[PDB]
Each structure stands twice: as C-alpha cells, then as structure tokens.
Design a protein around this ligand. Structure first.
Ligand code: NA
Ligand code: NA
Ligand code: NA
Lengths: 185, 185, 185, 185
C-alpha cells in the first residue's frame, strides 16, 4: 500500500487560478524543472476549455542557481483533465490530469496521471494550499501555498495530509522532502 | 575570451550514427534530463535531409535511480543544423544546431546553439569520442564515447580539448564535471 | 572577503542552554553536520581555569543514512583566545579556538571561531547566535533559542551576516543550507 | 547487512606507502572525505608499542570550497583490537580501531574497521585494499596503489563487496561514489 489516494474530492477547477509558491517537493520532482531552483512560483491560469477538454495553463518561474550567478527560468505547462468535462459543471470528483510541456502550439506529455491530493479552501472559497502528486509515493509530488512561507503548524498538517494520503511515513523528512528556498526572490 | 569555440571543423554528419556512452557532463546537463542517470546512452540516426534542411535524431536512455530502485528512462531529441545544407554534400564547416525535445509529431526547442566542440575520427572515418556543448561553460556540455568507459589518458585528452576550446579552466574538475556511472548495464 | 563581529561586549555567563541549528554554510557540513537533521547545541556556560575561559558544547543530531537515522552526539570546547580576568564575565569579542574533545583528549579544529552576531532579550539571554570565521568561506552557523523562526527573524539574521561582511550572493540556497528541524521526537 | 573479512592472514608489515582512493560509500563522507578530490592515504607500515600493533595514515585531499581548493591534511592511527606478538607481523583478520590524532592527543572515531579485501601483487604487496565495518552502512573505502583501475579490476573489487555481504543494490551510483583523481599534484 505505497499507493496514494486523493483526500480532497469535489474541486471547483474555476478557483485553481493565480499565484502559488513552491513550499517543498520530493526528489522525483527535481528530475525535470525543479533542479537548482529558488523562489519557485506557479501562476495557474484559470480553467479553460477546448471542446470537452478542461485544462489549466501553468507558468512555472524560478531563479535557477548556476553557482556563478542565477538566471530566471520560465516555462509553460498545460494540465489537461483525463476525463472529458461537461459545460454545465466546473467541478470534478477528483482532479486527475495529464501535465504537458507547452511552447507555441507544440505540446509534449510529461505525466499521464497528476492529481490534486489535498486542497485547503480559505474564507473566500479559494485555494490556500495544494498538494499535487501521482498514484505512487516515488512519483513527483509538490506542496504549494498562496503564501511564500507557512507556520510550522500549517506545514505539519500538509505533511500529515501526505500521510493520510498514504505516503510512507519514512519519506516525509529531509532527504526525500526538500524545502524550496523562498528567501530573496 | 568568455566563449567556448568549436575545435573540430569539416565534420561528416553521414557518420554521426550508432550508440555513444555518456562519460561525463557539466552540472547544467542535470537540470534537464540527466538528473539521477546511471548507464546513460545516446543512439544517433545519422544525417536526414528534409530538403535544404539537415537534422539528426538522438534516443537518450538511462537507468534513472529513485533511491529505492531504478526505472529505465527513454526520450528522443532532434538536432536541426542552423545553416541550410546542400544535397550534394554530407559535410558542414562547424556542427551548430538547435536541439528539440520530440515526441510523436511534436517538437519543443530547448536551445538554439548546441555545437560539436570536438570529435576524434578513426581510420574508418567515424566518431570515437564526441563533446557536445553551447557557447558558454554554463550551458549543458556532454563528453561521450564509442566505449562505455575510457582510459585516463583518453579522458585527460577530452578535458584538455575543452580547455583549448575556451571552457573556463576551474570548471573542469569534480563538482562542475560529473563522471556518469556506467557500472552494471 | 573578511567578516567582522557585530555583537561586542558579550556576557559569556548566559551562553548556556539548548540552541537549534537553523542554517549553516556548505563549509560547516565538512565536519559533523553532513546529513544531520534536528541538529542541536547544548552550551555549558562560562567555565574558567584561572585567566583562561572556555565553553563546552554537546552537539547532537539525527544523521540520515537514507535507510534510517543514527543519533550522533559529540562534544566540542570553545577556548577564548584572549585571557579573561576573574573580575568580569564579559569579553569585547567572543573569539575562540574550537576543539573536538572525548574524555581528557582534545584535538584543535579551528583557531578562529567568533560570535559574529547575538540577539539578547529583556532577561539578557540569547534569542539567536551567528557563529562564524574571519573569511566568508570559513564555517558559519545560525542557531536559535527556538527550533523554527519566522521568515521575518531569518531575514534579520541574514541582514546581520551582510553587515558582518558575508558576500550578499553567498547568502542564498546553494551556500546557506536550512537544517531540517521537523519531526524531532 | 553483515560484512565478513575475505582476505585472512594479512601481513601488516606491507600495509605501507601511498594508496589512492578509488571509491567510497556515502558514510565515509560524513567525516573527512567531503568535497575531497585526489584523496590519498600514506600508511606508515606496522608500528609497535610493545603488545599494541598500530599504523599511522596521512590522509590528504584537495577539498573543493566551490571558489577554490585548499589542501586538507589529517593523521589517523589504526590500533589492532587484539594484542600483537613481537615475533609475528601477520594477523588472521585486520580488525582495528581508528583514532584522529594531533600531537600527543587521540580521539576514537570508530572501534570496528576491517581490511575486508586485499589483492596481492607479485612483490607480495597490496595492489588493492577494501576497508569497512561489520555493517553495509559503516564507512567503506576502496583504495588502490594506482590513481585509476581498469573496469575489469573495478568489477572484481565490487564483486568482493558482494561476496563479503553488501546488498547488491548498494553497489551502484548513489551509495558508491567514485573519487575524482583528475588534475592532482
Ligand atoms: Na551519476
Ligand atoms: Na580500544
Ligand atoms: Na568526489
């Protein structure tokens, strides 16, 4: 049972919009865009439609550190929902999508199964915290927040959220969970 | 002068065919595909014209290690030479090319200036060793070879090639140059 | 690249108790800090052998061996480099040699470790300690009365390093490492 | 997880002069081998304190501080754990304690280090040593008379680790680190 289930069902894809800050990731996420990033940032667009496709664009931006200086690094992704989405509703029982790399009209599938695992709604019915993950503990997982920092309490909840989702309790500390440096930026 | 120069001119693209093994890379090669890679390999397709335009396909494979085990990892790349190439000739003054990530009928540009900096021919007019790289020491650079491993004399020679080419001398040692593990493949 | 003390006229008496390691530079990982989580320092408070003053330090952490954690404990001695009359318990500048110690043996590690910056509170006890060398590249440690600190407090501590003469570009992720102070049962 | 010595009846007389470090597991880095290139152990050959067999080691490396390399130089003392008769020069197993030393001071670091494997050359000397604890995750070091070794030699040495009781999975990159022996004065 190293297999992780979604906690947060019934997600209004409409309020998957605006800026989130990478708080922390597992190792498997550094493999593509994360490596050597500081001040990592996801500007999710809003929900968009091409016929029966629900999808959100993501602008990824970081200060990538090349030791003898930092270059800004920008890339667009496209989260496409795997199941088609009826135009009467904006809500899905589970957010389960294919993340593509996007440049002009060309697109390349990176992962066929990315999930919102956990979402905290705040007073104004919006996303304060998001955990994105695959169906397995070793597949790329990202903790992002409406804010650059979260108090130790928040962080232990988000980590406990990963547990109840079914991450090995052993993979919830330093070597396997890496804090993104959000300091200057 | 700041810039990495091509040493190996008048290159017969016809013979950029077959497997080469990753010996060593700079840190910046890891930001994209090589992050946790053992046993890394590049199969070239040899020259392909689609008219006045010359290009080569690379199948990248590695045993990427997730700490709890290794999956295989397979991607395709497309080197499109920047100058056009006449149909009579199979040769170019310098190998200068844009590199694309490809998948099905999709291509995403990653870099407008990747070069063959140095190549070692044999009597049978074919590539023993290759160094690919950009114009600065901070763009990805790869040393690869006909052979899974190489004697120190050969490695000392390839690193020197990089010195002569204009690659900053203090960036030719460990933290900045990473030997690829080619044990057990 | 010379760093100077900010905090002068420091009362050594009240350098006792438990400080948690918040952040180190890469240099400090060379000796006892590599792969440490939950890193803690217990100070003895001022001890004298006549005009010679010193302080003892119980270093402890949970070292991560990727497949589990050993508790690792060591003792260090800070000997003040200048003598210290049996009148006062205050020094113009805390400047000391640090020793590894085990029973009555003691091996010198560094002849210049300083208290760069110290924050006192109403009861004249230390909220935060920055320990450092004379060069930015020598080992540097940020430790607190508290296991975690607010982005605010951390920014104040980094500002202090700046004014002490750490290169502003040495004060971000690759060269300043946050210690994992979570799940420390 | 339990390792047994393979090379028995070792002549400690001919544990002398200069070995170059080929490779290491993660655990050796924790003390001195961090950021070390060109790592080198000069053994003193067997010394006697009557009943006590012991060997000195001048450890030296080029330590990489990112912005330049200092020489790093330490002395160790290997005391054999069972007393050694002055008639014999040869132990059934080399099981010894390693101390850091500096002038007349010594501090125990590990009380159970073993020569697991010695390869004898025609002068009946050590071509190759493997040092190591009883446990796969204790510090292990593969060191050779030569700065490099042939893939065949490397595979033979890694094979010895398997026969001695290392998990097959801990014999590849993340856990076995090759030492950079490039650019070494
Ligand atoms: Na590698
Ligand atoms: Na002993
Ligand atoms: Na190394």
């Amino acid at each position: 049972d190293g297999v992780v289930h979604v906690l947060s069902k019934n997600i209004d894809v409409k309020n998957l919009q605006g800026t989130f800050y990478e708080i922390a990731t597992n190792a498997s996420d550094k493999i593509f865009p994360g490596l050597a990033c500081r001040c990592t940032k996801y500007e999710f667009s809003g929900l968009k439609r091409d016929g029966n496709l629900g999808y959100v664009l993501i602008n990824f931006s970081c200060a990538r550190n090349f030791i003898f200086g930092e270059k800004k690094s920008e890339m667009t992704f496209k989260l496409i929902l795997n199941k088609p989405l009826d135009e009467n509703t904006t809500t899905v029982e589970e957010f389960n999508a294919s993340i593509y790399l996007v440049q002009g009209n060309q697109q390349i599938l990176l992962n066929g199964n990315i999930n919102i695992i956990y979402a905290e709604l705040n007073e104004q019915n919006e996303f304060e915290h998001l955990i994105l993950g695959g169906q397995k503990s070793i597949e790329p997982m990202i903790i992002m927040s409406k804010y650059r920092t979260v108090l130790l309490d928040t962080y232990n909840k988000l980590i406990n959220s990963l547990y109840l989702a079914g991450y090995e309790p052993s993979l919830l500390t330093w070597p396997f969970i890496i804090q993104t440096d959000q300091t200057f930026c």
